[PDB]
């Protein structure tokens, strides 16, 4: 039993809703544990993908002065790269697509949650896609490899391995690792994360159908 009482391969409460915003071309709202994430898609408009991951000042324990920081800039960079393989961009020449990811509340694993919600927003905008993109983090905490690390589990985590994939082919579209893993431990955490992605993918597809 983990600190919140989960199993080693157990996700946090997840719900995904599509089409919640009025102005955006496509949109999604994602709740994952404490995480509250809103995504808006604009375009294609006057093909590149332009992604801003941003956190609300009140999204964390201590008020985060608004404006971009180094961590936000990195996440924005790798998210744009994470989403790109899913989109059939050849249809819209010399234009741009905007993906605005707003973290309203954060509780660890937002970069993955962000991508997961973004893919839904992208589909909701009617962007031609060859597949969904779905992301999830695995990691290590009690000397044990576990799936979907919570915020305060990461407070004393031994490794964190965020992964984003294209469900159908299992193409790894995002991948990071910090902390300390043996090549054997890593192999498990990647595989465990990939399983989470496939499970979360069902919630993505259902949000679109609903």
């Amino acid at each position: 039993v983990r600190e919140d009482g989960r199993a080693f391969d157990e996700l946090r409460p997840l719900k995904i809703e599509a089409g919640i915003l009025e102005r955006a071309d496509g949109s999604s709202y994602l709740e994952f544990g404490g995480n509250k994430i809103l995504v808006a898609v604009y375009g294609p408009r006057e093909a590149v993908i332009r992604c801003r991951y941003n956190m609300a000042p009140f999204s964390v324990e201590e008020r985060k002065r608004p404006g971009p920081d180094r961590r936000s800039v990195e996440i924005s960079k790798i998210t744009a790269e994470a989403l790109r393989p899913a989109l059939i961009l050849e249809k819209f020449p010399r234009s741009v697509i905007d993906v605005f990811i707003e973290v309203l509340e954060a509780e660890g694993g937002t970069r993955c949650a962000g991508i997961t919600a973004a893919s839904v927003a992208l589909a909701d905008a009617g962007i031609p896609m060859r597949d969904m993109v779905v992301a999830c983090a695995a990691g290590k905490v009690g000397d044990q490899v576990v799936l979907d690390l919570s915020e305060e589990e990461d407070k004393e985590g031994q490794a964190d391995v965020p992964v984003a994939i294209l469900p159908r082919t299992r193409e790894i579209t995002l991948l990071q690792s910090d902390g300390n893993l043996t090549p054997e431990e890593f192999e498990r955490a990647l595989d465990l994360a990939v399983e989470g992605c496939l499970r979360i993918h069902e919630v993505q597809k259902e949000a679109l159908r609903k």
Binding site: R23, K36, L38, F100, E102, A106
Partner: protein, 261 residues
């Protein structure tokens, strides 16, 4: 050219609106509090489709050199690219700054919060309230939605007791306290279209208005904030008429806020 501006004008001059409401009628209002669990106070307001989330984040620091006995309020708004295709990213533009200052004016001038009670040590340590307005969706009338959400969030705010011991500032998170709220104030925004002022304008109406006026009224029917906007003029009658309506609407909005909480 200029067809929409004539179409929407003729309609309002003959006393009707595109979405079919009275000239002095708000859209549907939706108010939730305690939306962001980490935030000490928070709210989500929907006014039509215009959606704003506000968080209140208390913090301890230096008071201003010439108000050593007062706590601090800091109002800032993020007009997100999310909320509209005309919203540029980057630090707050003209439009954000105005919205922000007008909300700050309404909260501040109504003396809604007793900053004196936010003092901890005079001339050194006081409570700083970061009011952060997060514009999520823009479909007309940011001001009324903003003031409503900020007021709501302030009412929702609970902060730890700050005791003074030895000279340092002890935070006591066992005794959670509401903010010292002395009174409430809310805001009505009107748009001059044709020869008429219309209350709570839609995006369609904001596109074509001659001018706008926002009025902040208090519980006891006094004016604590006013802001003419737009590139066209208002007449004396337009202004005084807007006051008149605002003063009879705000008490309605005030009991709607109280009931939603």
């Amino acid at each position: 050219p200029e067809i929409t501006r004539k179409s929407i004008t003729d309609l309002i001059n003959n006393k009707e609106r595109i979405d079919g409401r009275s000239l002095h009628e708000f859209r549907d209002i939706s108010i939730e509090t305690g939306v962001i669990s980490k935030a000490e106070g928070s709210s989500r307001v929907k006014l039509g489709n215009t959606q704003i989330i506000v968080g209140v984040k208390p913090q301890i620091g230096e008071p201003f050199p010439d108000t050593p006995e007062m706590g601090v309020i800091l109002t800032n708004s993020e007009l997100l690219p999310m909320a509209s295709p005309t919203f540029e990213p980057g630090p707050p533009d003209e439009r954000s700054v105005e919205l922000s200052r007008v909300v700050d004016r309404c909260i501040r001038e109504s003396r809604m919060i007793d900053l004196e009670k936010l003092c901890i040590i005079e001339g050194s340590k006081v409570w700083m309230l970061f009011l952060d307005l997060h514009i999520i969706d823009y479909d007309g009338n940011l001001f009324d939605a903003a003031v409503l959400a900020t007021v709501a969030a302030l009412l929702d705010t609970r902060i730890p007791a700050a005791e003074v011991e030895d000279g340092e500032v002890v935070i006591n998170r066992e005794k959670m306290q509401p903010l010292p709220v002395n009174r409430k104030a809310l805001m009505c925004t009107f748009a001059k279209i044709g020869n008429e002022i219309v209350l709570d304008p839609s995006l369609e109406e904001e596109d074509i208005l001659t001018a706008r006026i926002s009025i902040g009224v208090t519980e006891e029917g006094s004016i604590c904030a006013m802001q003419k906007g737009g590139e066209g003029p208002l007449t004396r009658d337009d202004v005084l008429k807007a006051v008149s309506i605002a003063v009879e609407k705000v008490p309605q909005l005030i009991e709607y806020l109280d009931k939603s909480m």
